Design an enzyme around this catalytic site. Sequence first.
Site, PDB file in Angstrom:
ATOM      1  N   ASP A 138       0.848  -1.175   0.000  1.00  0.00           N
ATOM      2  CA  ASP A 138       0.000   0.000   0.000  1.00  0.00           C
ATOM      3  C   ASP A 138       0.894   1.238   0.000  1.00  0.00           C
ATOM      4  O   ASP A 138       2.070   1.178   0.414  1.00  0.00           O
ATOM      5  CB  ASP A 138      -0.881  -0.017   1.246  1.00  0.00           C
ATOM      6  CG  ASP A 138      -1.820   1.193   1.328  1.00  0.00           C
ATOM      7  OD1 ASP A 138      -2.836   1.078   0.650  1.00  0.00           O
ATOM      8  OD2 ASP A 138      -1.587   2.241   2.016  1.00  0.00           O
ATOM      9  N   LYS A 192     -14.100   7.501  -2.420  1.00  0.00           N
ATOM     10  CA  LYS A 192     -12.996   8.397  -2.714  1.00  0.00           C
ATOM     11  C   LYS A 192     -13.462   9.835  -2.781  1.00  0.00           C
ATOM     12  O   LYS A 192     -12.827  10.656  -3.431  1.00  0.00           O
ATOM     13  CB  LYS A 192     -12.257   7.976  -3.990  1.00  0.00           C
ATOM     14  CG  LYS A 192     -12.201   6.466  -4.183  1.00  0.00           C
ATOM     15  CD  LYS A 192     -11.334   6.081  -5.401  1.00  0.00           C
ATOM     16  CE  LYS A 192      -9.863   5.825  -4.983  1.00  0.00           C
ATOM     17  NZ  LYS A 192      -9.634   4.511  -4.254  1.00  0.00           N
ATOM     18  N   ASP A 252      -7.089  -1.960   3.330  1.00  0.00           N
ATOM     19  CA  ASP A 252      -6.151  -3.052   3.149  1.00  0.00           C
ATOM     20  C   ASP A 252      -6.679  -4.384   3.699  1.00  0.00           C
ATOM     21  O   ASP A 252      -6.133  -5.436   3.357  1.00  0.00           O
ATOM     22  CB  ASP A 252      -4.801  -2.709   3.774  1.00  0.00           C
ATOM     23  CG  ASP A 252      -4.200  -1.458   3.194  1.00  0.00           C
ATOM     24  OD1 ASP A 252      -4.587  -1.112   2.057  1.00  0.00           O
ATOM     25  OD2 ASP A 252      -3.353  -0.828   3.871  1.00  0.00           O
TER      26      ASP A 252
HETATM   27  N1  LIG Z   1     -10.787  12.210   4.395  1.00  0.00           N
HETATM   28  C1  LIG Z   1     -10.951  12.269   3.047  1.00  0.00           C
HETATM   29  N2  LIG Z   1     -11.940  13.013   2.503  1.00  0.00           N
HETATM   30  C2  LIG Z   1     -12.113  13.073   1.167  1.00  0.00           C
HETATM   31  N3  LIG Z   1     -11.342  12.427   0.263  1.00  0.00           N
HETATM   32  C3  LIG Z   1     -10.301  11.656   0.668  1.00  0.00           C
HETATM   33  C4  LIG Z   1     -10.045  11.519   2.120  1.00  0.00           C
HETATM   34  N4  LIG Z   1      -8.965  10.702   2.242  1.00  0.00           N
HETATM   35  C5  LIG Z   1      -8.580  10.351   0.981  1.00  0.00           C
HETATM   36  N5  LIG Z   1      -9.379  10.912   0.032  1.00  0.00           N
HETATM   37  C6  LIG Z   1      -9.256  10.752  -1.465  1.00  0.00           C
HETATM   38  O1  LIG Z   1      -9.735   9.467  -1.919  1.00  0.00           O
HETATM   39  C7  LIG Z   1      -8.669   8.670  -2.438  1.00  0.00           C
HETATM   40  C8  LIG Z   1      -8.833   7.234  -1.926  1.00  0.00           C
HETATM   41  O2  LIG Z   1      -8.062   6.935  -0.754  1.00  0.00           O
HETATM   42  P1  LIG Z   1      -7.779   5.380  -0.437  1.00  0.00           P
HETATM   43  O3  LIG Z   1      -8.758   4.615  -1.347  1.00  0.00           O
HETATM   44  O4  LIG Z   1      -7.877   5.068   1.046  1.00  0.00           O
HETATM   45  O5  LIG Z   1      -6.197   5.417  -0.848  1.00  0.00           O
HETATM   46  P2  LIG Z   1      -5.014   6.235  -0.135  1.00  0.00           P
HETATM   47  O6  LIG Z   1      -5.265   6.042   1.319  1.00  0.00           O
HETATM   48  O7  LIG Z   1      -3.748   5.607  -0.634  1.00  0.00           O
HETATM   49  O8  LIG Z   1      -5.293   7.596  -0.650  1.00  0.00           O
HETATM   50  C9  LIG Z   1      -7.384   9.372  -2.011  1.00  0.00           C
HETATM   51  O9  LIG Z   1      -6.336   9.291  -2.976  1.00  0.00           O
HETATM   52  C10 LIG Z   1      -7.791  10.830  -1.865  1.00  0.00           C
HETATM   53  O10 LIG Z   1      -7.643  11.519  -3.129  1.00  0.00           O
HETATM   54  F1  ALF Z   2      -2.065   3.694  -0.708  1.00  0.00           F
HETATM   55 AL1  ALF Z   2      -3.404   3.319   0.401  1.00  0.00          AL
HETATM   56  F2  ALF Z   2      -4.704   2.944   1.565  1.00  0.00           F
HETATM   57  F3  ALF Z   2      -2.351   3.934   1.722  1.00  0.00           F
HETATM   58  F4  ALF Z   2      -4.483   2.839  -0.932  1.00  0.00           F
HETATM   59 MG   LIG Z   3      -3.617   2.974   3.578  1.00  0.00          MG
END
Ligand SMILES: Nc1ncnc2c1ncn2[C@@H]1O[C@H](COP(=O)(O)OP(=O)(O)O)[C@@H](O)[C@H]1O
Ligand code: ALF
Ligand SMILES: [Mg+2]
EC number: 7.2.2.13
Lengths: 34, 994, 303
Positions: free
Chosen positions: B347, B458, B692
Site C-alpha cells: 500500500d 474516494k 487493506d
Molecule cells: N478524508 C478524506 N476526505 C475526502 N477524500 C479523501 C479523504 N482521504 C482520501 N481521500 C481521497 O480518496 C482517495 C482514496 O483513498 P484510499 O482509497 O484510502 O487510498 P489512499 O489512502 O492511498 O489515498 C485518495 O487518494 C484521496 O484523493
Molecule cells: F495507498 Al493506500 F490505503 F495507503 F491505498
Molecule cells: Mg492505507
Amino acid sequence: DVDPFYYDYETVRNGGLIFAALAFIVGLIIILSK
Amino acid sequence: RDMDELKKEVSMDDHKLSLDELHRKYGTDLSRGLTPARAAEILARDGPNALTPPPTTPEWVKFCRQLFGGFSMLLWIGAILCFLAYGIQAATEEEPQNDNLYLGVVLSAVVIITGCFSYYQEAKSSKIMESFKNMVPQQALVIRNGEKMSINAEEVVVGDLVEVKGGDRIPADLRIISANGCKVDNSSLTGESEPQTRSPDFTNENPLETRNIAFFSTNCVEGTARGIVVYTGDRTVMGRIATLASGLEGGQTPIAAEIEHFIHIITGVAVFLGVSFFILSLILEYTWLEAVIFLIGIIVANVPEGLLATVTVCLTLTAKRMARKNCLVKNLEAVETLGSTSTICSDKTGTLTQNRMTVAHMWFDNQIHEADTTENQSGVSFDKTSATWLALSRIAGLCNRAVFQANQENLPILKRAVAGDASESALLKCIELCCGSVKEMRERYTKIVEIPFNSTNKYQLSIHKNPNTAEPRHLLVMKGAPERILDRCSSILIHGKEQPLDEELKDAFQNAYLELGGLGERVLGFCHLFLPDEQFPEGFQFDTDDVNFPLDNLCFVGLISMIDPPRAAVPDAVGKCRSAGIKVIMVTGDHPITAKAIAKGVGIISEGNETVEDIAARLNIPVSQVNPRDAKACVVHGSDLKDMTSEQLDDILKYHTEIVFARTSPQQKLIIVEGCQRQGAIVAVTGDGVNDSPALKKADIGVAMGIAGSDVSKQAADMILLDDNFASIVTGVEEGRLIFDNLKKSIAYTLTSNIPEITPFLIFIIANIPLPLGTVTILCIDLGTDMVPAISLAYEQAESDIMKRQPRNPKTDKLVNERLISMAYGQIGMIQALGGFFTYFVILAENGFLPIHLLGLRVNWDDRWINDVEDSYGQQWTYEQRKIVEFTCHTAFFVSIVVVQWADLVICKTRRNSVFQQGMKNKILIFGLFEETALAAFLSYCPGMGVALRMYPLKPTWWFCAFPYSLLIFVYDEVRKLIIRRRPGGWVEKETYY
Amino acid sequence: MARGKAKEEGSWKKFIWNSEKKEFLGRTGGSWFKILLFYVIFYGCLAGIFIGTIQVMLLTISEFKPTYQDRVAPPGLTQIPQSQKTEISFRPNDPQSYESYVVSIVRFLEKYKDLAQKDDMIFEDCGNVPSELKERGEYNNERGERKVCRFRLEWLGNCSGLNDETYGYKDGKPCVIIKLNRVLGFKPKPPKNESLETYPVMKYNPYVLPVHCTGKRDEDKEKVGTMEYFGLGGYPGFPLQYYPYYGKLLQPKYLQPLMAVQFTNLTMDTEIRIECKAYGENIGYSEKDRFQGRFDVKIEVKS
Ligand SMILES: Nc1ncnc2c1ncn2[C@@H]1O[C@H](COP(=O)(O)OP(=O)(O)O)[C@@H](O)[C@H]1O
Ligand code: ALF
Ligand SMILES: [Mg+2]
Ligand SMILES: CCCCCCCCCCCCCCCCCC(=O)OC[C@H](COP(=O)([O-])OCC[N+](C)(C)C)OC(=O)CCCCCCCCCCCCCCCCC
Ligand SMILES: CCCCCCCCCCCCCCCCCC(=O)OC[C@H](COP(=O)([O-])OCC[N+](C)(C)C)OC(=O)CCCCCCCCCCCCCCCCC
Ligand SMILES: CCCCCCCCCCCCCCCCCC(=O)OC[C@H](COP(=O)([O-])OCC[N+](C)(C)C)OC(=O)CCCCCCCCCCCCCCCCC
Ligand SMILES: CCCCCCCCCCCCCCCCCC(=O)OC[C@H](COP(=O)([O-])OCC[N+](C)(C)C)OC(=O)CCCCCCCCCCCCCCCCC
Ligand SMILES: CCCCCCCCCCCCCCCCCC(=O)OC[C@H](COP(=O)([O-])OCC[N+](C)(C)C)OC(=O)CCCCCCCCCCCCCCCCC
Ligand SMILES: CC(C)CCC[C@@H](C)[C@H]1CC[C@H]2[C@@H]3CC=C4C[C@@H](O)CC[C@]4(C)[C@H]3CC[C@]12C
Ligand SMILES: CC(C)CCC[C@@H](C)[C@H]1CC[C@H]2[C@@H]3CC=C4C[C@@H](O)CC[C@]4(C)[C@H]3CC[C@]12C
Ligand SMILES: CC(C)CCC[C@@H](C)[C@H]1CC[C@H]2[C@@H]3CC=C4C[C@@H](O)CC[C@]4(C)[C@H]3CC[C@]12C
Ligand SMILES: [Mg+2]
Ligand code: NA
Ligand code: NA
Ligand code: NA
Ligand code: NA
C-alpha cells in the site's frame, strides 16, 4: 609387562580416556566461552 | 443448527430505551459525554474494561506433553520392551546379559533429556511471544466533557460515549445513539462476516438481532457511530461467553504441512524396515527376544527424533530475533512463509509513506500557489482575503471532519494531537495556522447531513446550513479524488465569479495535477454547490441513502496538495527485497501521478524503464498505438482494471517487471493479490488502512503497520510492525529463508546415517559374513551422532547467499525432495557406509581373517558350538574369542561413522558457499563434534563396556581407517558446491542442489 | 516472470505418461540416461576407492603370520565328536543313536591315517617319545614347505582300530578325543611344582603338556566315571615336538597332536558332566569362554 605375545591394553585404554577427557572438557569450554 | 439459544439466555438490555430514557439511566449527556471526574469515579467503582485472564494450561502438564511428543512417545515403547525383554532374560537364563537393562536406561534417558529440553525452549518462545500480547494497548475514542480524546480501552467505563469509525474495534457493548451509514462485523459472534448496519433504531426485540447494539470484540468495518457504554469488561456479551475470546485458534502453515508430510512417510519406511528386518532376523535364526530388540533399534534409527526439537529451537530463535525488531508475529511458523515470498503488493499512503502529511500547494484561479511547508511562521503565499481561497478553505475546513483532542487549545497548532484522516489532519492544521478557527467556522455552518469519506467512494460530502446573506440557505461541500471531483462539476470558481468549466481550464487542471502530483504530493479536489432555495426550502428533508440533493453539476473550487514523504527505510527496504528476487507491486487508491512518483522515489519503478504512456509521449504518437510489451513498467488506473478480464490482469502481471495499481478499490486490492496468487506465487501484503483488510486476509502473509495501521487491518495480518519500521520486512524475509535452510540442512544430515545403520545387516545375509555392526552399536550411531549435531544445525548462522538468491518455488524446493534423498542416501550415506565396511575388513584381516576368507563364515561364526574356526592363517578360534573381534569390529564401525559424521555435519552446514566462507561460528556445532567423539572414545575405552554392551577397546591404528573417507566427503561436497557457485542453471546444480 | 517452471500439472497419469516428452514419471531419455550414468561412474569409482584402500592395508600384513594374535591368546581345548550342545547322548546298545558321533569323529581322523602320511619330503618322523620344540626356523618363505611332524593312529590307544569302510568305534562306553587349538608360532609350556594341578603331576615335566578329565568342577559333585587317558608315549597330554605351528602357507598338511579319552564308566542310564583341563604356563582359562584352555562335555550312556 612384556613376555611372549599379547597387546598392552592398559595404556591404549588410559590413553583414550585422557583423550575422552580432552574432547569432553574442551567441548564444554567452547560452549561456555566467556 | 447453532447454539445461539444458549447465548440469548443471559441477555437483558436497553436497545429499547428512548434517548431521553437512556440519558437518565446512565446520567451522561448524550452529546457532551461524561465529566472526566465521573469517569475516574466509575472506573475505581467498576474496574478496567478488560476480560479477566483465562488460564489455558498449567506448567507440569505442558512438561508431560513435551515428554511424550510424537517421536518421544515411540521412544518409550522401545524403552519399555527393553526393560520388558530384560525381565524375560532373568527367566530363560541364569544371570544373563546387562545389555537390555542399560539399553532401556539410555533410551528412556534420551526421551527425558530431549523432552525437558524441548520443553524449556518451547517455554522460552511462549515467554517472549507473550511479552508482546500486551504491547498494543487497544485504544478507544471517547467524548468525555464535550471534547474527544483517545484513551486506553481499559479506561472506558459504563456510561461514557464511544465513537467508532471505519476499521475501529468496538471497545465495549454499545447502544448506538447516532450513526451515518455504519456497518459492523458480527462475524466473531454470528459466523457470517457480512457487514451488518448499525443505526440508532430499535429493530428487533432480541438484543442480538437489533441494529442499535454494537458488541464488544466485534469491529465496525466502515461508516461511523456514536454509542453509549452499556457493558464493560467481563460483563459484555463477549466476556460472558466462557469459551475463548482471545488465545487459541486455527490455521496450518505450509512449512508445518511440509514437515508433517515428511514425518508421515519417513516414519512409514522406518517401520517398514524394522518389521522386514524383524522377520528376516527371525528367519536368520535370530533369538525371539533380540529380534524385537533388533526391530526396535532399527525403528529408532530410521526415525529422526531430533527434527522436532530442532524445529522448536529454530522457532525459539526466530521469535527472539523478530522480538528485538519490534515485529509482532502471531504465528512463528509463518515467518517461514514470509521467506517463500515472490511478490510483495504494498500500500502507498501510511505504509511506504510516513502518513504525516503537510499542505504544500493549492491550485485555484488557474494559478498554482505555495504555502510554507516547514516551520511556517506565517500563512501561505497569497492574500488570505481572496474570494476563491475563501471558498476553498471554507470547505477544506467544513468538509473536514478531523478535530484536535481534548485540552489542547493552550498550545501551538502544530503541537496538538489530532483525531481523524492524516489528510484531514493536514487540512485542519493548515487552515488553523493561517486563516481562522475551524472550530468556529464549523459551528457557524451547522452541518445538516454528510456521507463520510470511504476508501471506495474516494469522496466525502456534507450539506451545511448557510448563515450569510448571498446565502442560498444550504451549502453543499465535498472533496476527494480530484479527477472524480472535477468530473462532477459544471462550473469553476474564478476570482469569486463562477463560470462554466471550459476545455482550457480542464487541461490546466490536468497540468496542475501533473505538476503538483509529480512532486509526489498528495492531491485533493475541492468543490461546492450553493443549493438553490426554491428547490430546497428551510425544513428540507435531505436524504443520504437515496440522495435527495445534487451529486452532479457542482462548482469546482480548487486543488490542495500535501507533502507525504516516503518512510525512511522504504527505499533500501524495497531495494534489498527486489535484490532477493521479490517482486514489489504498488497497490494504491491514490492518483496515478502521485503513485508513480512515489513508485520511482522508493524504487518500485526504476528511472530508465518506461511506461507505455512514457514511450508514446517520447515519439509524439498516440498511447493506444504503442505495443504494450515495449513497456517494462506500467501504472494501471483502477478505472480500467474494472474492465479487465482475468487474463488481461494476468497478462499485465505476467509481462511487467515494475507494476503500480492506481485508484484501486479495496476489493481491487484483493483481485490483484488474487491475480498474483493465480500465477503460482506467494504474496505478501503490507497494509495500514482498513481498505487493506481484504487483501491482507487473502495474502499468504499480511503485514500491518503497528501504529498508523487500523484495528481491523492489524487484526487481519500475521505481522504487526510495532515500530512501523518497513525494513522489518527484510529482517523477516531473511529470517524466514533461514528457518528453511537450517531445517533442510538438519534433515540432510540426520538421514545419512540410515544407509550405514542398515547396510551391515543387509550384507550379513547377502555375503554371509560376520555382522559388521549390530543393534547395540546402531543405537549409538543414532543417539550419538544423529542427535546433538542435528539440533546444532538449528543454531547454525545464516549463509551469505540468502538475500541474493531467488525465492524458493513451493512446488519444487520442498523441505524434503528427491535431490535430498539423492545425497543423504545415494551419495553421502553410501560413502559413510563404506567407511565402516573398510575398517571392518581391516580389523578382521589384521586379526587373521582376510576379507576373501570371510564369505560363508556367518553360519558357523555365529554358531555357539564350533570352536575350531579356522582363519586364513589356519589359526583356530573359539566362539567367544572370535566374537570379541566381531564386537570389536562393531565398536570400530560405530567409531568410524562418528568420524565421517564430522565431515557430513560440516558439509551439511552450508548448501551453497564453501565452509571457508561460512566459517565455524556456530559454537554449538563445534560442541557437538567434541562430545560426539569424546563419547566415542569413552564407549570403547571404558572398563566393562564389553561386558555390558559388547564394546571393546580399539588399537590406535583403527581410528584413522575412516579418515580417508571422512575427507572424501568434505571435498566431494566442497567441489560439488563450488561447481554450483560457478555454474548456475548448470547440470550439477539442477540435480544435486537439494 | 516469463520463465516457465514449477509443476502446475493436472494429470496423475504422468506417473507413466509421456506423449509430450518426459517418461516414467522421470525426465527425458537424455537426463534419465545422464543421471543414471552419474551414479554409474560415482558408485563405480567409489567402489574403486574401497578396493584401492583395501589393497593398501593388505600389504601391511604378512601372509606368513597374523599382525595380531592376542585374541586367540591362550588356546582352547576342543573335542572331535561334534558336540550337540556340548552333550554326547546316545543309547549304547543301539548303533543308530551314535552313528552321527561316529561319522564326525571318523571323518576327522582320516587326515591321520597311515596311508595319508606317505611321502618323506612333506612328512618327517618325530620320535616315538615326546621331545622338545622342533623349531623349523623363521616364519618365512626362506626354507620352503617345512616338515610335518607325523602322528600315528596307534598312539591314540584303543580309539583307532582297522575295519573296512567306516571305523568300528566305541558303542558301549564312548571315546572322546581331545585336541589343542592351532596358534601360529606357539610353544606350550608344561607345569612345574609351584602352580600344581587338581591332580598329582603325572610324569614328563620336560616335554608333555598335561590334560586331565575330572567330574563337574572340583567341589561337591556327583563323581561317577572311569577315566583312561590314551596318548603318544602313554602320557596324558601333548608332545611338545609338534610345535611351533607355521601356518597354512608353510605347513599345508600339518597334523596336530591328538589325545583321546575313552570313558569307560560304571554308571549307565544317566547324564554326567565332565571337565577336562590342559594345565600349564602357556595355558589360560576364562569364566566366560567355557572352551578356553578347558572343556565342559556332558555325556549320557542311557541304554
Ligand atoms: N478524508 C478524506 N476526505 C475526502 N477524500 C479523501 C479523504 N482521504 C482520501 N481521500 C481521497 O480518496 C482517495 C482514496 O483513498 P484510499 O482509497 O484510502 O487510498 P489512499 O489512502 O492511498 O489515498 C485518495 O487518494 C484521496 O484523493
Ligand atoms: F495507498 Al493506500 F490505503 F495507503 F491505498
Ligand atoms: Mg492505507
Ligand atoms: C549409549 C548411548 C549414549 C548417548 C547419550 C546422549 C544424550 C543426548 C540426548 C539429547 C540431548 C539434546 C540437547 C540439545 C542441545 C542444546 C544446545 C544448547 O545450546 O543448550 C542451551 C539452551 C539455552 O538456551 P540458548 O540455546 O538460547 O542459549 C545458548 C547460549 N550459550 C551459547 C552460551 C550456551 O538450553 C539449555 O539450557 C537446555 C539444557 C539441555 C542440555 C542437554 C545436555 C546433553 C547431555 C549429554 C549429551 C552428551 C555430552 C555430555 C556433556 C554434558 C554437558 C553439556
Ligand atoms: C520382507 C520384506 C523385504 C525386506 C527388504 C527391505 C528393502 C526395502 C528398501 C526400501 C523400499 C522403500 C521405497 C522408497 C519409498 C519412497 C516413497 C515416496 O514417498 O515417494 C513419493 C513421490 C511422490 O511425490 P509427489 O506426491 O509430489 O507426486 C508427484 C507427481 N505429481 C507432480 C504429478 C503430483 O514419488 C516420487 O516422485 C519418487 C519416485 C521414485 C521411483 C521409484 C519408487 C519405488 C521403487 C523402489 C521400491 C521397491 C520395493 C521394495 C520392497 C520389497 C518387499 C519384499
Ligand atoms: C534387500 C534389498 C535391500 C535394498 C536397500 C535399499 C535402501 C534404500 C532406501 C530407500 C530410499 C528412500 C527413502 C525415503 C525418504 C522419504 C522422504 C520424503 O520426504 O519424500 C518426499 C520426496 C519428494 O521429492 P520430490 O518433490 O522432488 O518428488 C516429486 C517431484 N517430481 C514430480 C519431479 C517427481 O520423495 C522422494 O524423493 C522419495 C525418494 C524415492 C527414490 C527411490 C529409491 C529406490 C529404493 C531403493 C531400491 C529399490 C529396489 C527394488 C527391487 C527389489 C528386489 C529385491
Ligand atoms: C594440501 C593439504 C595436504 C596436507 C600436507 C601434507 C602432510 C604430509 C602427508 C602425510 C602425513 C603422514 C601420514 C601418512 C602416512 C601413512 C600411515 C601408514 O602407513 O599407516 C599404516 C601403519 C602400519 O604400519 P605397520 O606396517 O608397521 O603395522 C604395524 C603398526 N601397528 C602395530 C601400530 C599396527 O599404521 C600406523 O602405525 C599409523 C598409526 C599411528 C598412530 C598415530 C598416527 C598419526 C600421525 C599423523 C600426523 C600427520 C602429520 C601432521 C601433524 C599433525 C599435528 C596436529
Ligand atoms: C592430506 C590431505 C588434506 C587436505 C586438507 C585441505 C582442505 C581441503 C581439501 C580439499 C580441497 C578443496 C578445497 C577448495 C575449497 C573452495 C574455496 C573457495 O570457494 O574459494 C573462495 C573463497 C571465497 O572468497 P569470496 O568470499 O571473495 O567469494 C568468492 C566466491 N567464488 C569465488 C566462489 C565466486 O576464498 C576463501 O575464503 C579462501 C579459503 C579457501 C582456500 C582453501 C584452503 C585449503 C584447501 C585446499 C587444500 C587441498 C589441495 C587440493 C587438492 C585436493 C585433493 C587431495
Ligand atoms: C582434523 C581433525 C578433525 C582430526 C581429529 C583427529 C583426532 C581424531 C585424533 C587425533 C589423535 C587421535 C588419538 C591418537 C591416539 C590415541 C590413543 C589410542 O589409544 C586411543 C585413541 C587416541 C586417543 C586417538 C583418538 C583420535 C585422535 C584424537
Ligand atoms: C543397501 C544398498 C544395496 C542400497 C543401495 C540403494 C541405492 C541403489 C539407492 C539409494 C538412493 C537411490 C537414489 C535415490 C534418489 C534418486 C533420484 C531419482 O530421480 C533417480 C534415482 C535415485 C538416483 C536413486 C537410485 C538408487 C539409489 C542410489
Ligand atoms: C592425498 C591422498 C591420495 C592420500 C591418500 C592416503 C590413503 C591411501 C591413506 C590415508 C589413511 C590410510 C590408512 C590409515 C590407517 C590404516 C590402518 C592400517 O592398519 C592399515 C592401513 C590404513 C588403512 C591406512 C591405508 C592408506 C590410507 C587410507
Ligand atoms: Mg486511507
Ligand atoms: Na533415527
Ligand atoms: Na492467509
Ligand atoms: Na548423519
Ligand atoms: Na539415522
